Amino acid sequence: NMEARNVMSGTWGELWLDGNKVAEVKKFQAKMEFTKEDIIIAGQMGTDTKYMGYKGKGSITLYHVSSRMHKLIGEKIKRGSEPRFVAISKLNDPDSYGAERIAVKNIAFDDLTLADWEVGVKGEIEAPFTFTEYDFLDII
Amino acid sequence: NMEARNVMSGTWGELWLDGNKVAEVKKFQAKMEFTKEDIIIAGQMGTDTKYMGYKGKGSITLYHVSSRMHKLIGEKIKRGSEPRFVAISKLNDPDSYGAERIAVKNIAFDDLTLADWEVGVKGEIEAPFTFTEYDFLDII
Amino acid sequence: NMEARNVMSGTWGELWLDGNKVAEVKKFQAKMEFTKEDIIIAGQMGTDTKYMGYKGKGSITLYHVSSRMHKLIGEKIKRGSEPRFVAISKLNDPDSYGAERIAVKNIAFDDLTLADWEVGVKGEIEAPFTFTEYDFLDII
Amino acid sequence: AIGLPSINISFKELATTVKERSARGIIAMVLKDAKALGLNEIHEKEDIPVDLSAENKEYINLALMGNVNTPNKLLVYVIEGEADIQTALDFLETKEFNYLCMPKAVEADKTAIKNWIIKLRDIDKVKVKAVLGKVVGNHEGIINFTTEDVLVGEKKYSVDEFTSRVAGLIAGTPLSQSVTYTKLSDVVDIPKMTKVDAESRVNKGELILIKEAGAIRIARGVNSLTELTAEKGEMFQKIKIVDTLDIIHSDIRKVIIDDYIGKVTNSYDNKCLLIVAIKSYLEELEKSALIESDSTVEIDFEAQKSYLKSKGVDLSYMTLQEIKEANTGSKVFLKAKIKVLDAMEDIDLSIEI
Amino acid sequence: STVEIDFEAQKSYLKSKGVDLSYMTLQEIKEANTGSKVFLKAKIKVLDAMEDIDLSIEI
Amino acid sequence: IGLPSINISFKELATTVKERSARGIIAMVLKDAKALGLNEIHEKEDIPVDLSAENKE
Amino acid sequence: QSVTYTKLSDVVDIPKMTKVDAESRVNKGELILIKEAGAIRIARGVNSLTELTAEKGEM
Amino acid sequence: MEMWLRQAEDRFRFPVFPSSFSINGKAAVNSSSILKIGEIATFGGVALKSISISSFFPNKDYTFCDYTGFPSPYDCVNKIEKWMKEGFILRFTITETNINMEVIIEGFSYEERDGTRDVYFTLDLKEYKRIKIPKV
Amino acid sequence: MEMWLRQAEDRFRFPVFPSSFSINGKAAVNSSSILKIGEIATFGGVALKSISISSFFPNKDYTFCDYTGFPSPYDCVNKIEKWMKEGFILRFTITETNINMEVIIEGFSYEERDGTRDVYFTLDLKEYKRIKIPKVTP
């Protein structure tokens, strides 16, 4: 059976980035994509597939209250190292069955925003990334 | 002769995925697409076609109340095996002529969503797939 | 802990272009984009990335009150020289923690607008650019 | 105890054939000995019990040989000479197997085995078979092997002694083939018989060895059944057809018992789930050359109508959809259509000029 | 499933107590005082698991 | 109520009879020594065994 | 679920019984052990009630 | 349709049927030029057919496989490589067509290119004709 | 899997496994002809295999590296260049496959093409065979 109260509300999400709580988070995405190859056989009308590999993609959106991302990246990209990060997301709605905690590991960001403002508009930051592996801490 | 009452409402649909009832389903699609080749003959103005093959496509949409897709997939993709699934969809409107029950077989999912939440928004999951064959159990 | 008052409002931004204050500024953007290369290894399912380089992009928007851009560029482009510019942006919301001041250096503009008017519409100017490096003067 | 590093070498025989994985290929043999006195499961040659007579060892070795695959397993029940065959039969009723053979059997023993097979197959609905020498069984469950002398190597085997080899032969061939014209490399020569003799024996429902096309092989793969009715057509005279039917029966029974009996409530949706599972198994059989390409599984409408009428429900007021989805109380009715393939055994040539 | 006041039992009890049941409306009988007794009735339905299967195959 | 019954039967293919109709009732008046009075015939197989062969035809 | 046809892995052997005897015992209202499908399992999940009235019923 | 390569009683059946197959045939034509009339030509003989196959050997039991029970990918590779090494005369047949002839292996290339451990291959075959030496 | 190039006891293991690898094999078929019959063919022996490898030598420790402790890119370049120059006989192996044979290096090219100081390379190897020497009869 399903109750309307059991649908998870996104207001009850939390995010940890590099071990520090991010109180100004707005949304969080993380998704694994699978690569397929089409199989076609002479004399058969149907078409089938086989899995080739997988890749990870996601993004983060924050309210602009401080220079968190510049401190996080700093000069690491400029100097030529390869910074990687770990993020932890939690979704714990009191009316749902339970919690859901996932660790997203080996994160590489796509860009860095220095300034983005306009008169009469409140500021926000968007930050896409890619990753390679994940772990489930709490399941529901 | 047709009546307005005979149009099937989508609120009366039901879905079974790998033998388990899914009470949080939102919509279900399944379609077969045919491939054609154009035939052109010198000296004639008209253009004709012949069939070449077919392919299956579809998708599912769910309310986010639990981690059903992760438990269904598990480590099967990561470990390199090739998992396949069976889905059964039923549409039984009391005001229609009868029921319509289809079995969709050899399903391969396209991606896996780990986290997708935003403050002030209720959660949903979307899961596209491809399949190879189908059976009809009840015809209206 | 986060407060609603700590979100920076864009009405409090300021811009200096080649050492002269620009009072008619409407919005300012500046972003660094990183280039990635996919790494695929035979016998492993996962796909990884490595950084290759970076590039800078941005734009400015102004109210049309004078011919600032034409005087700034002049004949430098026509005569075949390569002009470059320095821009400094400040964001200082009284309700926030502090100020954020960035210097954007080695700016090359993308185009020049000579006339763009329409009856019953107030005029605006848009100026995209690219840059190579930046410095941080005040960190919030 | 931890010792010095070493190399351990063991030697084994190279067999080209590979053991068959299916539930078929399990052969049950009954041999009377005064020493072992028990049941043993023989998976290979190295685990044959010691202190068993060399004669019974030769019978076991004959059974272990297969046609294209080796037998999956062997069940040997050792019985005292004074002990009755009925005790062995009663013990064997519980176990599962494909074929039964008894290298040493008197006419009374043969008729007891025949009656047991008939009773088990027809009354108790258990699919088992036996290979016997010079027994007129007139039943699909009895294989009648009538060849008096078989000379292999340097010794002569009687009609009853070679039934172990015959049972291994039948259990070693795949179901896509048929045992007809299978040749035995071990056999050296056999008593001479004319062509009309062999034809007359085959018409009587006997499995015989013949010399044809420069080799020694079996004539045709038929069982003991000779008289045909409307219910049992000519297709029930073939070993391959009956074997395929028994495989289908056993597999569907296994699926039903494992996944549905007593674990699932009796509603229409669960009936649909069961139908899907059975159709999946039938398609698995279709991909192999065992059955034809188009098969169907459905709800049995007439049976449900009869059950509802017997219970006393008024069927006139309800509609067909309501008849289909009515509650039946722990009972399910289904129907299916299949067509079973046969191996090619004759050629008809129409030659033009 | 349904749950409902048992009208027949209450009517029989009132008759047994000797009250004059004539010239009484149905609502009057339904809401009549019945001492310390309560009469109710209900209806439910329960299912059973699969235990017998018939599969007829045509060859 | 006995043991759980799981029986799988094999039989030959049977002919398909023609479909029924929701309208059309026929009344026939016959003369035979036995099987008197009204009779109801829904399916072709069900004819009284007492009747003569000509009446059955 | 129901306990019909649930197999006991720990049990290794039971005394011999025929199909007719087991069927008669189940008809008399007994819960027994049986050998079936290569294991030992409960034949049926019935209790000892054998006399049925108009209101009691088979359920 | 099925694809077989057989050496006497030793037979091998390909587990995944390819996406396409094509047979190539040619004939030789001899040309001469004659004064004031131009070019002329005559028949000169037919050449040997050739056929190329591309597919892969699967590392697991797929749904689209032709049958079940085939060997490991490198077992197939080793068997075909031995056949090419010794120069055996083989018989190649595609069922439901007119392709049934004796051949010899000219080339064999194999590779791995993803995370599945499947082995993709390309096989080149050439028609074989024996020469008849007359006697008296 | 792993990739190794070994000269006697001097072993080298590639830090980054390539994106793909392929073995090329051929057999020599002699062509002739017969009057009024057309073309005929005969078997002329097997040829030596060949393989080509493409990857890069990392200038830093990556998450996708096979192991830690490998040398600098130009040390690897110098080693392979010396082996190619002197014409050494080497053993080439890819684990979990059937590739294990003696080779000789035919070509080696390397380049730099971005800001990471990684060195991309292409290596061409050819199989090597030995002939038995005759022995005087007793």
TrEMBL record, chains A, B, C:
Pfam families: DUF2001 (PF09393). This is Phage tail tube protein. It comes from Clostridioides difficile.
From TrEMBL, chain E:
Transmembrane segments: none annotated. It comes from the Bacteria. Belongs to the myoviridae tail sheath protein family. This is Phage tail sheath protein. It comes from Clostridioides difficile (Peptoclostridium difficile). The chain holds residues 296 to 354 of 354 of the full protein.
TrEMBL record, chain I:
It comes from the Bacteria. This is XkdP-like protein. It comes from Clostridioides difficile.
